[PDB]
Subunit: 383 residues, 3 copies
């Protein structure tokens, strides 16, 4: 639907993924932190190409599409919350209920036959772990758990994150995240030197293609993901050679991190443990539009008591945010931006030359293709 049928015929084994330029409809996506939206202070954002309004009313989050039914203006151009449970379009004062999006009044024609006969599109919103998730899909939402990686919703898991807008397609971000050989870009990271990480340049893989990955379609809560197992067998590269001569050493720290790396629909990476043995990184690559994504980064630590919470909160601010989320992952931002041009025309998908460590990326593309809950299209954005 989104990509020239020419290209899609050439990528048979994962064509729906190559079509999914605007992301996957009928999933939950994190868009902002709970503390970023206050009572009666609506925030505007774009998710899967759609402009959305989010309001906190009596502490509960509500989501309306930020496009008036009348002349298609963004309500957020000038917000007019005239009662507590409504928003009034600034233009001809069509008035919508936050609760169901029902056109309930029109201040400029209070007898209009449209009143009570039209519905502004709403999306479910749920807050979990201090994160705002929107279900960008139609009808009754599934449980959040289905669209989160394992352990993110554990009772004791304390989540602290950072969010920013990155100018790459969401898929270049996923494949950067789930890439076993990409750790090459991280070899001079301050995190690797200061936190004395064990980090190879890469992996010479071992065993057959089936041993590289473990596809999880078997999860009780209905998660879809792929674990990378390139190491479980593979020989780590700590001495990078050219013509036999050794030109670069990996890092020989004592701290073992990234034992397990997994990627889950709709596009959330879990790296455990990282950046410390006492932690997990969960990061989403949320589609804003075809060119843009939220890099929604979270660090999880199990905490038992509020003193452990507050110690973690301090360590996040002083150590992990600036050293890991910025000073490790910043290289991941540059990497994603560098792939934009080769995939810009949708032709990257056919002219790329993959090697063995991309077996992981291939399984994710197949997983993504068969188990996605729908392909967002310009039809969803416009019509």
């Amino acid at each position: 639907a989104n990509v020239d049928e020419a290209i899609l015929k050439r990528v048979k084994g994962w064509a729906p993924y190559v079509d999914a330029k605007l992301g996957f409809r009928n999933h939950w996506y994190p868009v902002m932190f709970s503390k970023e939206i206050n009572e009666g202070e609506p925030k505007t954002l774009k998710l899967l190409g759609e402009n959305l309004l989010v309001n906190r009313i009596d502490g509960k989050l509500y989501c309306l599409k930020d496009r008036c039914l009348h002349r298609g203006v963004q309500l957020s151009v000038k917000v007019e919350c005239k009662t507590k449970s409504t928003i009034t379009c600034w233009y001809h004062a069509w008035t919508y209920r936050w609760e169901d999006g029902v056109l309930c009044d029109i201040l400029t024609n209070p007898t209009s036959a449209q009143i009570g006969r039209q519905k502004l599109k709403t999306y479910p919103v749920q807050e979990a772990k201090g994160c705002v998730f929107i279900y960008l899909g139609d009808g009754d939402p599934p449980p959040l758990a289905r669209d989160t990686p394992p352990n993110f919703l554990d009772d004791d898991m304390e989540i602290l994150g950072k969010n920013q807008i990155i100018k790459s397609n969401w898929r270049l971000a996923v494949e950067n995240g789930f890439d076993p050989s990409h750790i090459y870009i991280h070899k001079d990271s301050i995190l690797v030197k200061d936190n004395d990480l064990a980090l190879p340049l890469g992996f010479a893989p071992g065993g057959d293609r089936k041993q590289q990955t473990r596809v999880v379609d078997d999860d009780v809560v209905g998660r879809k993901g792929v674990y990378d197992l390139i190491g479980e067998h593979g020989v780590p590269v700590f001495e990078g050679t050219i013509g036999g001569e050794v030109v670069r050493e990996g890092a020989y720290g004592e701290k073992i991190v990234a034992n397990d790396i997994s990627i889950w629909l709709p596009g959330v990476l879990k790296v455990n443990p990282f950046p410390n043995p006492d932690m997990m990184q969960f990061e989403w690559y949320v589609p804003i539009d075809e060119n843009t994504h939220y890099y929604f980064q979270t660090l999880g630590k199990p905490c038992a008591n509020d003193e452990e919470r507050k110690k973690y909160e301090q360590e996040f601010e002083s150590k992990w945010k600036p050293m890991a989320l910025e000073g490790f992952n910043n290289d991941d931002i540059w990497a994603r931006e560098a792939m934009v041009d080769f995939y810009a025309d949708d032709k990257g998908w056919v002219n790329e030359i993959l090697f063995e460590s991309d077996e992981a990326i291939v399984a994710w593309r197949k997983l993504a293709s068969e188990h996605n809950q729908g392909i967002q299209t310009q039809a969803h954005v416009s019509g």
Copy 2:
């Protein structure tokens, strides 16, 4: 010729209007004020996508296409007017007569077979009420009166105004103007308060459409327009209610204004009286290109003699320009801008949801669709 055949098939009530992206060929359009162009000071501008040169020679206005027949450069890059009667292209000195566009000389080859055998496109131009009108069309022009609203050209009607370029398609501007319910956006305007206006939130209608408006397809001089008389049987709304409660009130001033509103081909609005009970607003939405229009605003006031004229002039400058043409209509500018996205892919014309107040807009779309003197196309602009 300008819009996907898919879309035109879905707006059969008024398809030619949806096609008129660049506006209507073979009408008069205001482009600037008489005072803004001095003797032998050529000015360049763009009208219906066409770059044009205007010059005043012995007090009279002449208009050439600003595109040399030879290599297609704008002459306005470096104007060479070497005789009153000619302009010389800066590139290879092809010399055109302002009066008829004839290639009369070539300084770089006075023996050229092209001399006397080529003609640069010219457009009729004339000044009325201190406004420069160009006839952007072919053949002999109609009287200017055909393309001007009633009373604009009256012996005693003093015209004063302001012009600015706005980044919206001209039709968005037309429809904001001729919108009885849009009035809502003006409800906190400094003019409404300080000129004590009786501005309701929304002129709501009353009855069956076929008298929501009067179609003038019958005017002596060939004028084509739509009067909105939504009320006269309908109603003004001063009490804006959500779920039965007054959330907002209109303006409680003495002065009855906007009593009658009319829109005229090729796209000019008359508001009588406005912004005071003794004057009228005439405003044009002149297509520059698909994305841009001149907002050509004028205020009309009957004046007996130059004493009444000079008095209207100081009132205009001290009061009506800042409070009305800026203070009031500045709202109308960012409103048009807010409609750009929904209509940018010509999809807004299929996806819009109208209510009763828009009956007058629909009449305009039909009137415009039936009585325009041609669709400007990219063929007319280039080839």
Copy 3:
């Protein structure tokens, strides 16, 4: 490929040239001066739409396509030359030899089946007269002499130059260069007044259109060019008239310049003598993309020894560069830019109205159509 057939069928005799938006494959092109690329300091540039990486290894230049075979990133985002003969992609460490582009290693997986089974595109590179030439084409190169004007490579010819990126298609630069009547734009030039150059406004052509130019396809090194001979039989315009009235004079002067003007594939102008009787000007218009070219300007002065070269360089820096290459040719830059709009949509090639001196430009469009060694396409750029 590049242009619609509705256009190409209407330019029979030079359709390939109208098609060559990105210029001609299988020719040498200057891109920079030798002094600009130092030992082991690689530089990026775009040529004929393609991103290229040039490096100096043991004094010799090599050129690799600046696009990894793997995920198609530019290597130059972060240059890693680990050994003298290789460059390592910063992402997954695919390692290429400069000499033949062979994938000789991958640091992230030294057992990859890809090693020794993939080639990164190379292009020959050659330095002459302090200028860097890349053979942007396939197979083995002809000698450089084929793609240089006569006398450029002469033993005693001292070359001093200047390079800058100009926002026009390369063909508008060439045509402006070789346009006999474009000298009209230089009538007010400081160089013409202060160096007392004889400069007419243009030429009334002398008789037969087939003696306005000499085509050269029978040269010792396979050079392909046209000479403008309009000055041979032409009558110079020194008194430009409008209606018989002298409105502009040419520049009287003792210095006869531009006795011979010739344009050579792939798009290099030679003007002899210029800007002084003891010097020549060679300028290339090198395609960067559809919209952009290198204006690669050089001045040749036969120098018999080293006081002569130093003396020449003094003159260049103090007078010729600012007065001639800058002062005089800045009007050529503005002239190119002024034609961009008419030719942008490819309609200019059909809509232009040519006159007698354009015989030179038509002869060049035929020469280029006949003797170019390949049309560069998006296929060569993307895949």
